[PDB]
Amino acid sequence: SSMRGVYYPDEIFRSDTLYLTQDLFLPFYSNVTGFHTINHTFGNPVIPFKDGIYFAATEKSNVVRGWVFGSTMNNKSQSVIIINNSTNVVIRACNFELCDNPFFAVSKPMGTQTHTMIFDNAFNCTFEYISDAFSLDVSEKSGNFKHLREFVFKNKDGFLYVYKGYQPIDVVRDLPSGFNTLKPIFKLPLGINITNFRAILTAFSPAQDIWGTSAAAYFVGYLKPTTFMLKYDENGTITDAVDCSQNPLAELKCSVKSFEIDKGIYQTSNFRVVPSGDVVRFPNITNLCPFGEVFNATKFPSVYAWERKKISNCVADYSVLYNSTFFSTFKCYGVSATKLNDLCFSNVYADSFVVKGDDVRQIAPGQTGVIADYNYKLPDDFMGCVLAWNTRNIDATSTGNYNYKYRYLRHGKLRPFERDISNVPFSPDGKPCTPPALNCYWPLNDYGFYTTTGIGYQPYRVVVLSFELLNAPATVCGPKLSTDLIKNQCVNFNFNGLTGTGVLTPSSKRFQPFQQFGRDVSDFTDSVRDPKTSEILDISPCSFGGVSVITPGTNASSEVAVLYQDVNCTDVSTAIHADQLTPAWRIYSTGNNVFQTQAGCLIGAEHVDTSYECDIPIGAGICASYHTVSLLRSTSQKSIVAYTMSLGADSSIAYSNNTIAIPTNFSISITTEVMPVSMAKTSVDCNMYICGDSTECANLLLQYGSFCTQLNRALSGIAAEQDRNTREVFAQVKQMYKTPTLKYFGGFNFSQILPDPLKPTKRSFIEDLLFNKVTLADAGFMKQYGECLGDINARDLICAQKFNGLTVLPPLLTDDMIAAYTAALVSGTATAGWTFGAGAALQIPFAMQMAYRFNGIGVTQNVLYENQKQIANQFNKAISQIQESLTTTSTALGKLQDVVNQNAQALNTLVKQLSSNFGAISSVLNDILSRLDPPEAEVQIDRLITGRLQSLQTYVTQQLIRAAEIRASANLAATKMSECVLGQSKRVDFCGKGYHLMSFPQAAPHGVVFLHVTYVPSQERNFTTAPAICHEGKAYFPREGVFVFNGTSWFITQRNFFSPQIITTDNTFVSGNCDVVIGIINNTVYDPLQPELDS
């Protein structure tokens, strides 16, 4: 059950793109419940709806005649019902009864069950709807069960969204894997709380007699919040999709925004081990609150004696007091007594006294009147609570205890707590209130009656307490639990309020008796004393690191291996140790065969002992590749392997005390070198980029001062310099030499590297390959497999960007002007050699110019003229192999392609940061200016302006760095132009490789390419040799070259090319005597004069 159930996410849709989005999609390869349904295996069972469902059925005649959705679908509350009349869909919102197989199928008069609506039977029809032909569209296709009706139902924001598609079927009870996309049909506003549903067969048993047909098949699968990448075509159609959760390859190609991936290692996500448990530790129990005084005095205070306090820095036993069977009543006005058992506060205020049983009615926090107002009533502003217990048995007396008097009225004491406590004739609001004279009065009844009085009289001792809540330190709390300790696992933990997540370990970390926990050199905490055991624990973080995917090209294989960076494989997954296959959907996006490296834990690759060159790099000398490994596995004999890299081919120079190796033959070579020279010249209208023509944003921007001019000054410097770079590399020629008619000098064929006038455009044939094989921002093209041609996007628009305040500007020299400078340099080089790089250009025959370039590398001139046929044939062949190479693959042009790709990523990141929220209510200025008043809109806009302006400073700073990095390559290229092309550099490996003969420049987009011509000696003899020779009395030494032995005879030769010559007075010089030199051999030096004296 897979690749079903994708729908167009909304109505805003658009052409030819990869769009990555989050929604309640059906995740790929989840198990759908197939209700295979047949006669006795039969019913319409109610099913939970959850977050929404993919639903499908094998169908034609609308056998699934409808659906019912709601909380209950039968009683009290409204329900949505959807029914196929024989033509059309019916919708109602009514609270239907549906006690059985649902057959309340009564319908309106105009085409009953056929056109006008059905299920009329209920009591709250707040919505009703008639469709057109939405049951005939099912009935259109040929034969029942030979088609699948396919739907998504999702409920959010008070809307039921309905999407559908309808497709052919071959198996009457299966759900095929064929990809198709559902269209939206409805966004029903009905607001119903759907949590359950059922399909409707409405007592049907179809005349489509496959089984007698109290039977069908239908399918339910739950939607889940998942990230899909959706691929649109040029008609705005979804054509493909990727569930980014499924496996590490799906995650990779979502992260890369592509459906195809090249061979490489890619970073995709962070691994971060979750905690297994929780550890809470607190000290030995101590500092119990002094409640025994307030609560457990043997005889309590009278109403007027009223013992009272406030208490702090203590642990409250209130859980016990609440758990106590004693108290006749207790009430909290504040937060519930059930939580005061464990809650924390800055302090408590507490007091105690007595009442005749009746007056407990008035004493509470939240309660006031002339009883409590004139002997104890507290302010109702604390977390106040009140408790009562038996005075009737203890501190009562049978007369009524005349010491435990009644409340002492004093109407004028309006203030809380003061609420006249006092034993005084004081009852009025303001009369003189001495002792007993006729001005003033005292209620003086007895409260404390004994337990044999009626249950009204029966008096209570009473306590009130009042907890105080502040941001200040909570000096009172209920008791707190300590857990078991959990060593050697990632856990949550808490000491005395030092909370974290980590791995707790036993430790050797000695520290002083007064110290509770250790910091480290970073000043993060790393060790703690256990408050109960006094164990010295050491804390380290739970394992985390980058996750990287190792892949061949997806072109070649969809197998992948995964590297968890830096971690020990012991911490990594509860795996199943197959090579090749990650059980990834369930197991850690990964889940299989394991290997350890210093880079971290490597999964799914096989370790191989045979070394190879490094294909995909990993670290610490480990590399990976896609390789044949076991012929027993059929084509899957190719798997990902990991190995220690080979440094190079092993070799053994046979060092000899008296042997020298000298070349007998040579090979000409042509080597490409590719260099970047300039970036895309860019500018940004910062006031449009920030504000989008919001006038109010344009006002607020001015407060920041120079920035919008400063950034444009900086980019104008970078932009001007791209023309300086391009000018300094190419404009080294003094004069524009005309390209000659004859393209062929002394057998050497230039016709592929000069322009051709007979066949426009006006570039060399090799420049046409080079201008083809590069991708601009998304215009142009290049691919490493060799499977691409023609621009991937609009060229005069680069791909997009020219509409967001961003702009890109033309170069000063057009590509035709660059191709005119290379045509000038090559035609000058072919007709005049080094001379135009010093004086004026001097004509010289190309064969002679080559002989003097051979002479420059220490190969004597005659070697060229005697071999000119071979040298021309090797040159002409090597030029043709450059065309074959550039035609085959663009992998040589990677440097020029990268200059574009970095600039594309720089602009696309700068554009994406426009959409970013930055802690405003919205990233859209029209929202902020419509939803709010100006004094709030200013703060919202200021957050956007600050975010956007910081985003521009980032981009221009990246471009300053990148421009400086490109300038270093423009200066190096300008140097190679002067030294390699205009001359013959002797700097080893500066121009080409081997001995340097000459070089030709060629134009390329954003760069230059050099074709270096070099001479490589390539076959060698191995000769006996001597440092000097002794003739008569004296050592003779070679003027140039080496003395070597031909097996027969001693000869002298140049050491770049074996050319054995007679040893003579001409090619040797004398020094010293025969004894001085080590290992001098004894042989004749010939004299050209002696036979002429003998004449």
Ligand X SMILES: *[C@@H]1O[C@H](CO)[C@@H](O)[C@H](O)[C@H]1NC(C)=O
Residues 178-217 that bind ligand X (CB under 6 A): 193, 195
Binding span for ligand X by CB under 6 A among 428-436, 465-473, 487-495, 1078-1086: 1078-1086
Q: Tally the C-alpha atoms within 13 A of residue 241's C-alpha that lie toward its C-beta.
A: 29
CA dist., res. 527 & res. 529, Å (int) = 7
Using the minimum distance from each CB to a copy of itself, give the nearer residue, 209 or 650: 650
Using the minimum distance from each CB to a copy of itself, give the nearer residue, 387 or 491: 491
- Residue 142 binds which entry of ligand X, a copy of itself, none, with Cβ cut-offs from 5 to 8 Å by kind? none
Residue selected from 284, 574, 634, 652 as contacting ligand X according to rule CB under 6 A: 284
> Looking only at residues 91 through 150 of this chain, which bind ligand X when binding is defined by CB under 6 A?
95, 97, 99, 123-124
Using the minimum distance from each CB to ligand X, give the nearer residue, 477 or 972: 477
> Nearest approach, Cβ of 500 to ligand X (angstroms)?
22
What is residue 116's DSSP assignment? B
Task: Tell me if residue 895 falls in helix, strand or coil.
Answer: helix
- Residue 321 binds which entry of a copy of itself, ligand X, none, with Cβ cut-offs from 5 to 8 Å by kind? ligand X
Of 48, 92, 81, the C-alpha closest to 195 is: 48
Using the minimum distance from each CB to ligand X, give the nearer residue, 61 or 764: 764
Residue selected from 399, 659, 710, 950 as contacting ligand X according to rule CB under 6 A: 659
Does 741 bind ligand X (CB under 6 A)? Our answer is no
Binding span for ligand X by CB under 6 A among 550-558, 773-781, 809-817, 912-920: 550-558
Using the minimum distance from each CB to ligand X, give the nearer residue, 33 or 398: 33
Of 393, 397, 391, the C-alpha closest to 460 is: 391
- Residue 794 binds which entry of a copy of itself, ligand X, none, with Cβ cut-offs from 5 to 8 Å by kind? none
CA dist., res. 282 & res. 315, Å (int) = 13
**What does DSSP say about strands 1007-1026 and 1042-1045: parallel, antiparallel, or unpaired?**
antiparallel
- Residue 712 binds which entry of a copy of itself, ligand X, none, with Cβ cut-offs from 5 to 8 Å by kind? a copy of itself
Q: Tally the C-alpha atoms within 13 A of residue 602's C-alpha that lie toward its C-beta.
A: 23
- Residue 719 binds which entry of a copy of itself, ligand X, none, with Cβ cut-offs from 5 to 8 Å by kind? a copy of itself
1091's enclosing H/E stretch is: helix 1090-1093
Does 1078 bind ligand X (CB under 6 A)? Our answer is yes
Does 264 bind ligand X (CB under 6 A)? Our answer is no
Tokens of 129: 């709807």
CA dist., res. 948 & res. 927, Å (int) = 17
Q: Strand order of the sheet with strand 476-477?
A: 314-315, 476-477, 344-345
Using the minimum distance from each CB to ligand X, give the nearer residue, 559 or 721: 559
- Residue 730 binds which entry of ligand X, a copy of itself, none, with Cβ cut-offs from 5 to 8 Å by kind? a copy of itself
- Residue 850 binds which entry of ligand X, a copy of itself, none, with Cβ cut-offs from 5 to 8 Å by kind? a copy of itself
Using the minimum distance from each CB to a copy of itself, give the nearer residue, 326 or 524: 524
- Residue 326 binds which entry of ligand X, a copy of itself, none, with Cβ cut-offs from 5 to 8 Å by kind? ligand X
- Residue 446 binds which entry of ligand X, a copy of itself, none, with Cβ cut-offs from 5 to 8 Å by kind? none
> Looking only at residues 228 through 257 of this chain, which bind ligand X when binding is defined by CB under 6 A?
234-235
C-alpha gyration radius of the chain: 47
Using the minimum distance from each CB to ligand X, give the nearer residue, 426 or 748: 748
> Nearest approach, Cβ of 427 to ligand X (angstroms)?
31
Q: Tally the C-alpha atoms within 13 A of residue 726's C-alpha that lie toward its C-beta.
A: 25
Does 307 bind ligand X (CB under 6 A)? Our answer is no
Does 885 bind ligand X (CB under 6 A)? Our answer is no
> Nearest approach, Cβ of 1045 to a copy of itself (angstroms)?
14
> Nearest approach, Cβ of 876 to ligand X (angstroms)?
6
162 touches 77 (CB < 8 A): no
CA dist., res. 900 & res. 893, Å (int) = 12
Task: Tell me if residue 561 falls in helix, strand or coil.
Answer: strand
804 touches 689 (CB < 8 A): yes
Using the minimum distance from each CB to ligand X, give the nearer residue, 201 or 388: 388
Residue selected from 665, 716, 917, 1090 as contacting ligand X according to rule CB under 6 A: 665
- Residue 725 binds which entry of a copy of itself, ligand X, none, with Cβ cut-offs from 5 to 8 Å by kind? a copy of itself
Does 654 bind ligand X (CB under 6 A)? Our answer is yes
- Residue 454 binds which entry of ligand X, a copy of itself, none, with Cβ cut-offs from 5 to 8 Å by kind? none
Burial of 1063 (0-12, 13-18, 19+ CB in 10 A): buried
Pattern 324-363, binding to ligand X, x per CB under 6 A? xxxx------------------------------------
How far does CA 824 lie from the centroid of its chain? Answer: 50
Does 29 bind ligand X (CB under 6 A)? Our answer is no
Q: Kindly report the CA angle at 466 between 464 and 469, in degrees rounded to 5?
A: 170
Backbone φ and ψ of 49, nearest 5°:
-90, -25
What is residue 190's DSSP assignment? -
1064 touches 1087 (CB < 8 A): yes
Using the minimum distance from each CB to a copy of itself, give the nearer residue, 110 or 988: 988
460 touches 364 (CB < 8 A): no
Q: CB neighbours of 165 closer than 8 A, spacing ≥ 6? A: 150, 151, 180, 181, 182, 183
Binding span for ligand X by CB under 6 A among 112-120, 634-642, 918-926, 1082-1090: 1082-1090
Using the minimum distance from each CB to a copy of itself, give the nearer residue, 191 or 545: 545
> Nearest approach, Cβ of 439 to a copy of itself (angstroms)?
55
> Looking only at residues 1019 through 1058 of this chain, which bind ligand X when binding is defined by CB under 6 A?
1022, 1024, 1030-1033, 1046-1048
What is residue 860's DSSP assignment? -
Burial of 824 (0-12, 13-18, 19+ CB in 10 A): buried
Does 75 bind ligand X (CB under 6 A)? Our answer is yes
- Tell me the sheet residues that pair with 25: 224
Residue selected from 156, 272, 487, 532 as contacting ligand X according to rule CB under 6 A: 532
Length of the chain: 1095
Q: CA separation (Å) from 761 to 484, 755, 883, 885? A: 82, 9, 18, 22
Task: Tell me if residue 1040 falls in helix, strand or coil.
Answer: coil
> Looking only at residues 375 through 404 of this chain, which bind ligand X when binding is defined by CB under 6 A?
389
Q: CB neighbours of 1057 closer than 8 A, spacing ≥ 6? A: 662, 663, 664, 666, 859, 860, 863, 1017
- Count of CB atoms situated within 10 Å of the CB of 457: 18
- Residue 555 binds which entry of a copy of itself, ligand X, none, with Cβ cut-offs from 5 to 8 Å by kind? ligand X
Tokens of 660: 């020298």
Tokens of 206: 């179809």
Q: Count the residues of the shown chain that bind ligand X, applying the rule CB under 6 A.
A: 64
Q: Kindly report the CA angle at 969 between 963 and 975, in degrees rounded to 5?
A: 135
Does 323 bind ligand X (CB under 6 A)? Our answer is yes
Tokens of 906: 């720089």
- Residue 682 binds which entry of ligand X, a copy of itself, none, with Cβ cut-offs from 5 to 8 Å by kind? none
- Residue 99 binds which entry of ligand X, a copy of itself, none, with Cβ cut-offs from 5 to 8 Å by kind? ligand X
CA dist., res. 1069 & res. 687, Å (int) = 81
Residue number of the CB closest to ligand X reads 1079
> Nearest approach, Cβ of 707 to a copy of itself (angstroms)?
6
- Count of CB atoms situated within 10 Å of the CB of 149: 22
Residues that bind ligand X (CB under 6 A): 1, 31-34, 71-72, 74-75, 78, 95, 97, 99, 123-124, 175, 193, 195, 234-235, 284-285, 295-296, 321, 323-327, 389, 532, 553, 555-556, 568, 570, 654, 657-659, 665, 744, 749, 751-752, 785, 787, 1022, 1024, 1030-1033, 1046-1048, 1060, 1074, 1078-1079, 1082-1084
